[PDB]
Amino acid sequence: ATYAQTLQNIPETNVTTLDNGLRVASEESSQPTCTVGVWIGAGSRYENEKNNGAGYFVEHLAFKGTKKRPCAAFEKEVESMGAHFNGYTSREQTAFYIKALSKDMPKVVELLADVVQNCALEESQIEKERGVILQELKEMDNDMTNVTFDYLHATAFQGTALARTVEGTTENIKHLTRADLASYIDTHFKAPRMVLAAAGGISHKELVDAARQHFSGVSFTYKEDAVPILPRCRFTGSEIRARDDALPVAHVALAVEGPGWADPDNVVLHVANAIIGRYDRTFGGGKHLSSRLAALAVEHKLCHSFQTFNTSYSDTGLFGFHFVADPLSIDDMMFCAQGEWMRLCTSTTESEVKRAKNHLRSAMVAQLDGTTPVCETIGSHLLNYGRRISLEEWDSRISAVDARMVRDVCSKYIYDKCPALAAVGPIEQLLDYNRIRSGMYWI
Template sequence: MSAAPPLSSILRHSKPVFKQSLKTVSPVLQSSLGNGFRVSTQAKAGDTCTVGVWIDAGSRWENETNNGVAHFLEHMNFKGTSKRSKRDIEYGMEKMGAHLNAYTSREQTCYYVKCFKKDVPWAVDLLSDVLLNSERSEANIEAERRTILQEKEDVESKIDEVLMDHLHAAAFEGSGLGLSILGSEENIQSINKSMIDNFVATHYTGPRMVLVGSGGVEHDQLCDLAAKHFGGLSSDLNKPNTFTRYLGGDKRESNQHLPVSHMAVAFQTPGVGHPDANKLRLLEQLLGSYSRDKGEAAYSCFSRAIVMDFYDPNVGAFRIPNPSSHNPVHSLQAFWAPYADVGLLGFYSIAEPGKSYGHDYESICGYGMREMVRITQVISDEEFERAKNQLKLQTMLQLDGTTATADHIGRQVVSHGYSQPLGAFFEELDAITKDDLVAVAHEYIYDKDPVVSAIGNLDNIPEYDVMRRLTFKVSL
């Protein structure tokens, strides 16, 4: 059997492939109406498309009293309008073979339709109708309240979502980013028509909305449709002057019945509009992920840190366990959660709790912390090139479909006013040097206050002061 070529030789020959692929990517076109409402499109060959409206209005713009209202509104907008009943909306979707969906995040709300190119005028008319003419009767509000409470129960059964809510609550206590998207059960029970109407009047204005089209769309046609359906929106910006304060800190929830412990650790970073944003994306890719079930080879920082410790480096591709050691780490995943002006870079670990097999949770956390601190001082040439190429490939794969492309454009436009062309992103990525990456990692990670959240058996999870020391005192 012939040996596989070294990873470095593969990476050296991959750049022309990306450059060739970029030639097929059409530009993103953007226009604005007189009231500040924007239209942004990226055409692709084909008869299908995604058109949607992205709104700069999520749970970040709420307060302790009305927290959950943006998500509640998303539900209400599917209950019917003055000219379409809920059944009419559903029947219209089925008749056209289309798909209507929506989501609410911490910073944005989105409503989009996947349809045929010929049905774009109908889709934009529907979107404007559900957004601007929704009937929010008391009966519908009460009916939807029960649905949202059930959804909250479902979300609270997902440990990863609860853990990230805890992480945000600790990091941004006292500001909108620290609030959950659904809100508390008490808030869901108290949200009323007046709260919803006030939220719409404040946030659903021209300058804070963008109509996005991807796939078989024509920019001029969408501009005309936007003027027809959204031209009457207020031109007031009405964006609250929020102050987001990062506190760091610690939030933990004990649950002795869980077979594994979940823990997240993160550091404050700038947001998506900052010059360091793409460097932070690259750091996330560099750190990568590890999954015990998938048996990944040591091609990321986290994989190598665990594989080389628990598995015999002389056996194959590091996938056969060393019988003399037990690996208590189920997974270790890097993440960067960016917002308009701030972000969180860190890792999420799932591991067996307690002091078992000679490894306590402090040493388990040490894998994540050791790699995060290591990249503030040294990064190898091979892992640097690997991260760059993997980020390029993943970006292109993620933007392969019309819905993912529309979402990418919409989120960028409402966050910082424009969508960065893929070619410009690749050029900026290519211009990043290894020293640049080390410097950025050092600025935001080394000897900085982390934020920590944990759920499960907490007996042997390190205290916050131990985690703080690990930001500068780890063995490299």
């Protein structure tokens, strides 16, 4: 049983489409337990100045009961069967999923459909959640990492839709109407823009059947079955600096525009990020870590942590890094960081990519560790690539990557580009934009 063989013997992912336009996909295994959910192509990016944070507001009511069954009833029924109900809303994607015994795959599918189609939107529950959401905005405001990434999007995509945060504005949350949420749901939670995904011990045909039974309400016009292409979001080389020397450590995020889901180069960018890696003060490896940047961080105590990232989207994306450091080590950290980025475009080695490729393989395999994560892969893949991509395909693609390819792709997206910068906390030591911009060439 070799790695190759195990990859080929993995059960295939089955997909079928209903007449209403909804897609049903699932990967079958022999597990008494399973996860099934509906991945919707909706998010803050689809909102606008007036209904920003509606998709989030909805995510708060999607579990407070439907028309067929009020709050208590809905909750009791789900709880009493040992099932877990979770979900989330991002900028371009939303999801509501359930974990339970394969023995209930069908009852669950009915529950899901009831959630996405007949949300009660209890007028009173809405005012109750209005205050809850307002408390979460103050909680999240202390999450420097997330405040920093929000700011990164706020400036990198300023003037556009991707500039808004998922949770939305205070004004919006204070004034969103029962009608707005309703409108949101109707406008976005639509069959062709959704995906019923399930993984575990489930019958694809039994899944698709319960699907036909509950996911119905077909469309008449053509405007109801077309998936609206979103207007492009302009990337802008710039920086937003939120200074507060009262904060203990500083967060910094730098990034360049990325390609977008469908682009093959993403396989290389991920290998690239694998070379630089990530780090945090609890990595036993210490000064021996393969990641050069990580090694330097340890030697010179450059930061508390740092991480690379390649955040994709339909038509764009953010490729960069983020670090947390003491006010007095920001400059050296940024220096070494930008240094490693130059090394990438200019002097990557075969040994380097070899390691990074391996690291990347076990990374993709790790994202399929359980029913929920695999179910998440399916929902996302069909929603982003319009098809599931096997580990064997990925591996096929990953294997083709070499040093030269890394240098060329990185040079393409990084070298001499104007980055987007977001800095929060005690950032006096972080040099100006011009100096950082110069770190973008020669290495």
